[PDB]
Design a protein around this ligand. Structure first.
Ligand SMILES: *[C@@H]1O[C@H](CO)[C@@H](O)[C@H](O)[C@H]1NC(C)=O
Ligand SMILES: *[C@@H]1O[C@H](CO)[C@@H](O)[C@H](O)[C@H]1NC(C)=O
Lengths: 62, 411, 97, 98, 49, 49, 48
């Protein structure tokens, strides 16, 4: 629901709006379906996760 | 005919290029805008049918395109590289470009300044990539450029010391490595001064970020016009649908309502068409930004004026709201002097041509120097190639070409 | 009928002056004017640098300078005739009008 | 596998490329175009909407863009350079271009 | 409607002209102001000036 | 796909009444006298255009 | 009958010399290698 607080109307609040029927997961994966505001959904069930931009790497400088 | 100007000094110049990458994503509910809460109008709208769906599809395509545009410009790195904790890079200070830990946003100081400067059934949809995520992509690009040079763009990142990378870039512009190493402290100071000036220049001039502001303003103006058009009667008795229903018999009322519905549909169509044309302009700018990111940030560009004015050395990407700012570091020749020049030197009845330089004369002596910077060197067999005889060449001057072997042979 | 054509801010004469400036710089300063302050260079030497860029040694330009100059002059002469002879070449501009 | 072709002579070719840079700038008086000189229809036009303002804004934007296009292509020189009075350049004749 | 059609067509034509102008500006910098190593950007053959 | 969708949309648009009694022109002509028919036909023509 | 080194875009035959050639590896690895003399500038001066 776009622009609606969850209380107003498996519940998660995102900047885009309330999401129902998807369970938020802390683990991050490459985006499958773009809900918006950095939140993406995939079928694992349906899960909402913050998209992972890339695997972190540390460059070496000497 | 015989005079050449060779620069005896250099200036490191940082120039900022601001390119729009994305535009606000908007969605329209056709029923809400055209009919409000009137059920009767909604039933009448169903006859038109596909027009509303077509408008929605066009807007949806624009929104997905905007997400794609941001991805193309920024998501050129498959891993998020992290700058090493030690921040010494050959006397070059990258504090302004690099991210600041203290800030909650983690944006760079220049990015923070840019962020601050930029300021009915219609809804604005949030961008998929958050500003923090875009900043993280930018940080990865900066870390790669500073630590691995251009290798990260063309393959896995390969570590190189930053002064050495700068020396390679000097070779790209035709200046020898020695110039960078000999004058490293000066070059570092010039670079640092330029970055500080950049922060002041962007802050001082409002029009500097004008292109981004223009995109935001145009979208706002279009939405405002659309909202205003609701008031317009369009030749109907009254703008309000309920007033028409209340004051007129049902057949006549239907005709008047039809006039309002058609006018409102025309207004939405005009908005959608204008947005499509604007989206095409933004897409062209986004493609240009992606090309600049690859050619300038991820490599040294031999194209003239593509990455700043002057001989391009390196470029740094900075995220800005709905846009990308490129800081272009360029080599600018300075302090030119005039020297007599000859195409070839005639020694031993043979014509000698500079292998990678221009023959120049102080007045009594002849030297071979690199074109970009004045570094006079004795004419020798090593720095010259012999082709033909003196007669064919025009303007050839007689002078001695030293041989390195001859002194050793004499000894 | 309410349809009006607004004059361009830059007059044709002013555009010609800009073009003349570009030509003067290129002939006398080579490519330096684009990358910075104009730096004087003899035109034959500038051409020699350009030959080096395309991968041909500068000796070729100096040794064959008269031939190259004659060929360039002939080509420039041909262009005026070609443009006048064929309307299609200027067709794109005409299409806009 | 063992054969290569190497050019033994060269030809200098001058070719012409034509690119449009600007288009005619136009402005429309909405009232004159639709209503002519009739006052009554002008009032009716007022009732239809604010479309005329939108049209004027779009056309004005095109006009400004055309001036910007010319500036971008031609105004790339900080100073107006003047050709040397003696036009001798190694046997190259630039008379037609100059 | 006729006026609206004219404006829309002019906007599309303007976009095409703008693209051509951008190409012209790019050529002016790449070809007039420097030697271009890109193939066929500034004429057939190896670009000189 | 985009080309196919656009053509399908136009065919679909033919169904729309546009405030007329019927989408079919022949029905309008058969059931109405020339003055009323002209108004209804005008609405259809404008929408299709 | 003779082998020369030339610029790719124009034909300017030059005697193969150490100055215009760089030595890497041994003959066996390369395919299509041919045997010809490579002149050394130092040797005539040394002989004198
Ligand atoms: C260049 O012009 C000068 C006179 O200004 C003349 O003396 C000289 O011979 C000319 N050089 C060439 C190569 O023609
Ligand atoms: C070249 O091709 C010929 C056949 O046309 C073959 O006999 C010869 O061995 C080949 N040489 C090389 C070096 O591959």
């Amino acid at each position: 629901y776009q622009g609606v607080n969850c209380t107003e109307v498996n519940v998660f609040q995102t900047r885009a709006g309330c999401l129902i029927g998807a369970e938020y997961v802390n683990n991050s994966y490459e985006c499958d379906i773009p809900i918006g505001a950095g939140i993406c959904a995939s079928y694992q069930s349906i899960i909402a996760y913050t998209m992972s931009l890339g695997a972190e790497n540390s460059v070496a400088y000497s | 005919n015989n005079s050449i100007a060779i620069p005896t000094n250099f200036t490191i110049s940082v120039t900022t290029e601001i390119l729009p990458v994305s535009m606000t994503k908007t969605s329209v509910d056709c029923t809400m805008y055209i009919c409000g809460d009137s059920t009767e109008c909604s039933n009448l709208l169903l006859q038109y049918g596909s027009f509303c769906t077509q408008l929605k599809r066009a807007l949806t395509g624009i929104a997905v395109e905007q997400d794609k545009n941001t991805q193309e410009v920024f998501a050129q790195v498959k891993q998020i590289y992290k700058t090493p904790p030690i921040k010494y890079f050959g006397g070059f200070n990258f504090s302004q470009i690099l991210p600041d830990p203290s800030k909650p946003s983690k944006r760079s100081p220049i990015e923070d300044l840019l962020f601050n400067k930029v300021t009915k059934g219609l809804t604005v949809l949030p961008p998929l990539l958050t500003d923090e995520m875009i900043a993280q992509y930018t940080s990865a690009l900066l870390a790669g450029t500073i630590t691995s040079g251009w290798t990260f763009g063309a393959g896995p990142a390969l570590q190189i010391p930053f002064p050495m990378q700068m020396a390679y870039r000097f070779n790209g512009i035709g200046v020898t490595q020695n110039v960078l190493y000999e004058n490293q402290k000066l070059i570092a100071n010039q670079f640092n001064s330029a970055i500080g000036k950049i922060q002041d220049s962007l802050s001082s001039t409002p029009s500097a970020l004008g292109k981004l502001q223009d995109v935001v303003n145009h979208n706002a103006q279009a939405l405002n016009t659309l909202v205003k058009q609701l008031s317009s009667k369009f030749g109907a008795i009254s703008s309000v649908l309920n007033d028409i229903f209340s004051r007129l018999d049902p057949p006549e009322a239907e005709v008047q309502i039809d006039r309002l519905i058609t006018g409102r549909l025309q207004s939405l169509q005009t908005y959608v068409t204008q947005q499509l044309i604007r989206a095409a302009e933004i897409r062209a700018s986004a493609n240009l930004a992606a090309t600049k990111m690859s050619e300038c940030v991820l490599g040294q560009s031999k194209r003239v004026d593509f990455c700043g004015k002057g001989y391009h050395l390196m470029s740094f990407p900075q995220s800005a709201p709905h846009g990308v700012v490129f800081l272009h570091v360029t080599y600018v020749p300075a302090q030119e002097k005039n020297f007599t020049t000859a195409p070839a030197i005639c020694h031993d009845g043979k014509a000698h041509f500079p292998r990678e330089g221009v023959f120049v004369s102080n007045g009594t002596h002849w030297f071979v120097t690199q074109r970009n910077f004045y570094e006079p060197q004795i004419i020798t067999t090593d720095n010259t190639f012999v082709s033909g005889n003196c007669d064919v060449v025009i303007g050839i001057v007689n002078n001695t070409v030293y041989d390195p072997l001859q002194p050793e042979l004499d000894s």
